[PDB]
Amino acid sequence: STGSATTTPIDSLDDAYITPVQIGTPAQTLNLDFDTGSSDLWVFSSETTASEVDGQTIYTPSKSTTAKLLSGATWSISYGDGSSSSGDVYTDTVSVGGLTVTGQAVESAKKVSSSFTEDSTIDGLLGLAFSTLNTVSPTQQKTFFDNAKASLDSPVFTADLGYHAPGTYNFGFIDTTAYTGSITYTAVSTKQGFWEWTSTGYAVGSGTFKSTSIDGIADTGTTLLYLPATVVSAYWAQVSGAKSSSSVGGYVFPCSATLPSFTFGVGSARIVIPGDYIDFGPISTGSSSCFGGIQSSAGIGINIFGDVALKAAFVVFNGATTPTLGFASK
Ligand SMILES: CCc1cccc2cc(CNC3CC3)c(=O)[nH]c12
Incomplete structure (x- = not known):
């Protein structure tokens, strides 16, 4: 298999890039920040403290027929810039640009720090570093790439970011x-x-x-x-x-x-x-x-x-x- 998705700058400065990701059944499309520096796939959700949501699209697992609560699992992450988020965990179907993983850990935010709230364009992160950094406790979870790897035509992904313009993330081929x-x-x-x-x-x-x-x-x-x-x-x-x-x-x-x-x-x-x-x-x-x-x-x-x-x-x-x-x- 392969996948291919367009990634788009969030603003006129290229402060970050968002890529659409389908989660759940029926699909809920969220715009995620693909992050090769971390290893959690987490999203704004129906569980996020209401005052901490300001314009983001949320994942509602109760409306997904393939969502299952991962019993007892929690997550909490802090990033280099001092921002943070935390919550609980579901498994669900996640697709990127035509590439589908079933049973992907989708980390639902109960809390996010101010910088995330203040950025209405980013609905969450999709981590693409190594799964050893994943913060889910007590049972560490795999990244989207690690889950997809064996099914891919070749065990690779590529980043082609644009300057003031869209670009592409490809999975499984060069x-x-x-x-x-x-x-x-x-x-x-x-x-x-x-x-x-x-x-x-x-x-x-x-x-x-x-x-x-x-x-x-x-x-x-x-x-x-x-x-x-x-x-x-x-x-x-x-x-x-x-x-x-x-x-x-x-x-x-x-x-x-x-x-x-x-x-x-x-x-x-x-x-x-x-x-x-x-x-x-x-x-x-x-x-x-x-x-x-x-x-x-x-x-x-x-x-x-x-x-x-x-x-x-x-x-x-x-x-x-x-x-x-x-x-x-x-
Ligand atoms: C891309 C980062 C960026 C872009 C454009 C402007 C800034 C301004 C600052 C400094 N403001 C802090 C001291 C109050 C910054 O740290 N990062 C910026």
């Missing part, structure tokens, strides 16, 4: 028309439950490539590119007037600037992030100071190749017995 040149594969460590790999270095604009190992995670659920302070300093030094602002909480730059590209290494290959991808717009409405799309990972504890980086590439998440990651230009 669309060879979706990228240029070849896919370069690189080793993955699953020891922390993430798609963790090591970039071979970077360049800023037309500058020379610096060969240096940068360990980090391929994370579709993080907006920005988080890298070591030395690297980030080298980037923003090429932008007149750019500076790290303590009050804003990162590097900002004059909105009148033309940003340089940023290149990252994948083995001997090179992925080029155009400068425009690094512009995240005014820090506040009407401001002429703009927020940067490359920020320091210092104090996160890990480097994160988020959407800013991933959207510059066609990315293969290879779930073979020994997982690997593939990158191609596009």
